[PDB]
């Protein structure tokens, strides 16, 4: 009786065998959504009718077919739009943004200051760099994270800093107790997994909040953010990294919360 | 007998006043090229047919009439296209450009290293700036150069930094012998300027090659370079600052420079 959406999915094959499980598809088919998968080894608007688009694809011929199928067919959402991913690209960019949030909470929400360093002479003659604490988390300028060199790393001696390959962003990485919240955040749906960084969580409602910010800043619906408390003052926040959509079938419950997200984005008014 | 050009200029009255000047349009008519002012209160498409489009105009509305004039017209050069003039606002991405020039000449290019500051509180409790030797470079993160407090300001000691607004980059300023080069640069053509900075000019065919290269990294015909030398070695240069249609009516002979340049442009294949 009532009419069915389509889900197209453009995704790389293994984010494919992680993200798309048996269960979301059966779920999400009970429910009246047919996820389909997007043929790569074809034009986007040569494929058939869509009512949402998720994906996880980089480069310009993608992203060229994303600005024609935008152009064409406006009313159909994009999970996420390749403009709002790219505000991830440039770690000093993407802190920018996340500068830009009102915090006007008993809890308080930092930026940390950051190291840029551009070439080989740099890496060994900046001073600055000898009055640093390690650990360092040092992460390339732009990146994308697709290839495996494109992640946050920790550095404990100067020796390890001076192998690593510029242009890149340090970070002073001391104050946070060993304690790391990794918060996956789904549209309007927010979860928290204390870690122990180095291989007593913060109020949800100041998460949530943040969560909210974060959302409407970088107009993405799927990501996740590094957070730890500075353990100075026990009461103020900082995010480290922000990395678009994540590795959420590692989280049990998942099928459920993005069954739901995919609902509330084909009623979108 | 010979066709005449269209110079449209769209410009803010005070780069009007400075740079189109009365020996500027009588040479450049004397050569067959009009310099016709764009109404800023009128639409671009309502406006007369151009052979080229030079302004110094920020703003989404003008984006927009520079997009569609782009769109609807191809083969129109535009000096320059707001998407290089982008280029130029985040410092940190802007210096990312000229770090992935190719330097492969006996004198050497760097980017020096920077620190970027998100907010109040990191200005006061940053550990690393108390080891910053004074005196330093500030300038706001993302800026356009449009507001005056958009400029790259000198700061002598700690007070004198605690009284910026973040997010700011900072860079050590002590290594270059009090000489900044400001070297001015219109499409192929260079012109050289040793300042004494705090209120022995580099080899010409070095200055050329990396003006050549900030002109096909940046995508941009109209703009200057700060440099200065490394006085420690005395043959290695860095690159400290670049800035978009600089004030060139301040150079004697800068009618000649733009009227060659204003025609190449209108020969462009
Ligand atoms: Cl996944
Ligand atoms: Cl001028």
């Not at 197209?8 to 065998?17: E, F, N, S, T, V």
């Not at 709002?84 to 006007?104: G, P, T």
């Not at 009461?235 to 998942?254: E, H, Q, S």
Request: charged letters at 20%; one cysteine or more.
């Amino acid at each position: 009786h009532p009419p069915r959406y389509v889900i197209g999915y453009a995704l790389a094959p293994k984010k494919q065998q992680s993200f798309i499980q048996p269960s979301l598809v059966a779920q999400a088919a009970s429910r009246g959504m047919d996820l389909v998968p997007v043929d790569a080894s074809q034009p986007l608007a040569e494929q058939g009718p869509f009512h949402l688009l998720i994906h996880k694809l980089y480069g310009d011929d993608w992203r060229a077919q994303l600005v024609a199928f935008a152009a064409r067919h406006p009313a159909v959402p994009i999970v996420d739009p390749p403009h709002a991913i790219d505000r991830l690209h440039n770690r000093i960019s993407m802190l920018q943004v996340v500068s830009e949030l009102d915090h006007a909470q008993d809890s308080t929400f930092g930026i940390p200051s950051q190291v840029v360093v551009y070439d080989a002479a740099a890496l060994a003659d900046f001073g600055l760099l000898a009055a640093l604490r390690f650990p360092l988390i040092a992460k390339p300028l732009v990146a994308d994270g697709t290839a495996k060199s494109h992640k946050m790393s920790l550095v404990y001696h100067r020796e390890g800093l001076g192998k690593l390959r510029p242009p890149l962003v340090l970070q002073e990485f001391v104050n946070h107790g060993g304690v790391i919240f990794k918060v996956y955040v789904v549209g309007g749906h927010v979860t928290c997994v204390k870690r122990r960084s180095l291989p007593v969580v913060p109020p949800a409602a100041f998460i949530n909040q943040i969560a909210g910010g974060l959302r409407r800043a970088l107009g993405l619906q799927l990501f996740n953010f590094d957070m730890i408390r500075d353990v100075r003052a026990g009461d103020r926040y900082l995010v480290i990294d922000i990395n678009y959509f994540p590795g959420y079938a590692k989280m049990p419950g998942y099928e459920t919360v993005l069954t739901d997200f995919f609902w509330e984005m084909v009623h979108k008014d």
